[PDB]
């Protein structure tokens, strides 16, 4: 009932065995080595798409690089997913999450725009949420160069990218884009860059994760909050879009995704809360290393598909 | 959903046109006319079933009347739904909720056992939850009197019957029955009868509902609380079965269902929280008077089906 999946144990062993630069092996985590290691073992290939296209989105600090993923070359008007990557083991960009965004596009049969928002410390807050909001409003306008007619937005993101989902949804709630946000899907969201990581002894499942693995997740959280800066949404959640919130059972910050789901329910916002029992923080980009993550991701995508179908059915009824 | 649905506004005008609450209560003849009115306008007919069978369940206060609904005359082994009715606009029995339990059995394609648990003031607390637990344990043993073998339980109930779902799921969590409870579906649960009904002032949608309508829901809630009694589930919710929790947008006690869904999420229990925007307390037996309630119920049934499918994949 308290457990670690066997593929999860293997990944945690792989993390503990990662040597350092020939400079000094010891306890070694050069971002360069992490980048090589995670690119190699983490996720499946991007694979085949009808559309895989670089975009340039006009933004308040210059052009925002983005990328369109679509199983189809062309399609009827419908929703578009806008994706905000999180970070941790790697800083994160279009390449780190590209296999996930391609697979999301295939399973939901919808176009996915992934956003390469400005990172800290090069670009202070509020560059990251400004870019995410600019990108959502641009997609919502159905720009000629996108080659898609967009009738609604779905926002998706992982870890601190999850908080970029929450803050962008709240911004478009307060000042709507051309079309509405009809669903949010934050994966294991990190909802407060101000909040200190739990210590080993404060996590009830610490004994299952082990101190050495928990140190990895702590380091990832700290690095992520350094690079991906957004404000906690501590105010009223009334009028936020219907949600799928997914946590990791072995994630020391599972309480952050749980509390967001709980606050949505208390405000009367529909929410599907799921927890990946015996899986870790960061699983959506670990679908090769930890194949049991596929089931976790597919369960989230099925819930999101139900919200989208119901949301479009309720709009066809109202009109 | 547009603050008050047109069909809901029509039902509230219908309610205002009946003889209504006096000194914050429904007296005996007012309630009597309301019950005939609700029987005449509320729900569609029971309709066609492959099985519609009366049952007698042994319980700690005598026999417990129950009724099996099933579209199929005969079926492979599978989950069984146990249903614990609520009340308020109806007294609550096998007849008042029969159309709902029949439609639940058809849509899910599963047997539903509705339970006629002992009521107060004749049988005081804890007869109701005792009967509900006994009935669930009985169904779990796959008794010969059902023509059906049971691999798992699903618990479902409305209003004070929603709290019988919660208390019963907790009892079977602590001391398992022969098969597990794989899902819970409380509709607009009343989770703490000892709490005061919200005032017109305290309910944020009071102005949409109107004072006269609010007095009706308050009187109907008091009438239900007299008949159907269980105490709040007090401890840790960890280990509780995966849930679909449905509230009413115009229901003064929506905070109770919202808070239950929120407490499940905090404990790491998977939960689908849904709120029927612009619909009222008691909609699951108002599918004829308020046809828009069909969409609310089918949405809850679709989410419940996803839980059952995932529960049986995993096993
Ligand atoms: Cl922000």
Residue numbers in the entry:
A (entry chain A): 3 to 321
B (entry chain B): 3 to 317
The authors write:
We report the biochemical features and crystal structure of a novel esterase from the family IV, EH0, retrieved from an uncultured sphingomonad after a functional screen in tributyrin agar plates. EH0 (optimum temperature [Topt], 50°C; melting temperature [Tm], 55.7°C; optimum pH [pHopt], 9.5) was stable in the presence of 10 to 20% (vol/vol) organic solvents and exhibited hydrolytic activity against p-nitrophenyl esters from acetate to palmitate, preferably butyrate (496 U mg−1), and a large battery of 69 structurally different esters (up to 30.2 U mg−1), including bis(2-hydroxyethyl)-terephthalate (0.16 ± 0.06 U mg−1). The typical H-G-G-G motif and the G-X-S-X-G catalytic motif are conserved, and EH0 clustered together with family IV esterases. As with other reported family IV esterases, EH0 has an α/β hydrolase fold with two different domains, a cap domain (residues 1 to 43 and 208 to 229) and a catalytic domain (residues 44 to 207 and 230 to 324), constituted by a total of 9 α-helices and 8 β-sheets.
The crystal structure of wild-type EH0 was obtained at 2.01-Å resolution, with the P212121 space group and two crystallography-independent molecules in the asymmetric unit. While E53 and Est8 are monomeric enzymes, and EstA is a tetramer, EH0 is presented as a biological homodimer with approximate dimensions of 6.3 by 4.9 by 2.7 nm, which is assembled in a twofold axis symmetry arrangement that buries 5.6% of its total surface area. EH0 has a long catalytic tunnel with a very narrow entrance (approximately 16.8-Å depth). The structural superimposition of these proteins reveals a high conservation of the corresponding catalytic domains and also a common spatial arrangement of the helices at the cap domains in all the proteins except EH0, where α2 and the long α7 are visibly shifted very close to its EH0 active site and are apparently impeding the entrance of substrates. Thus, withdrawal of the cap domain seems a necessary requirement for allowing access of the bulky substrates to the EH0 catalytic site. A deep inspection of the active site showed that the nucleophilic Ser161 is hydrogen bonded to Glu226 from the nearby α7 and a movement of loop β3-α3, including the oxoanion in the conserved motif 87H-G-G-G90, compared to EH0 homologs. Additionally, at the beginning of α7, Trp218 is within a hydrophobic pocket surrounded by residues Phe13, Ile17, Leu28, and Phe219 from the cap domain and Phe91 from the catalytic domain, which is also anchored by interaction with loop α1-α2 and Pro23. In our study, some flexibility at this region has been found from the two conformations adopted by loop α1-α2 observed in subunits A and B of EH0.
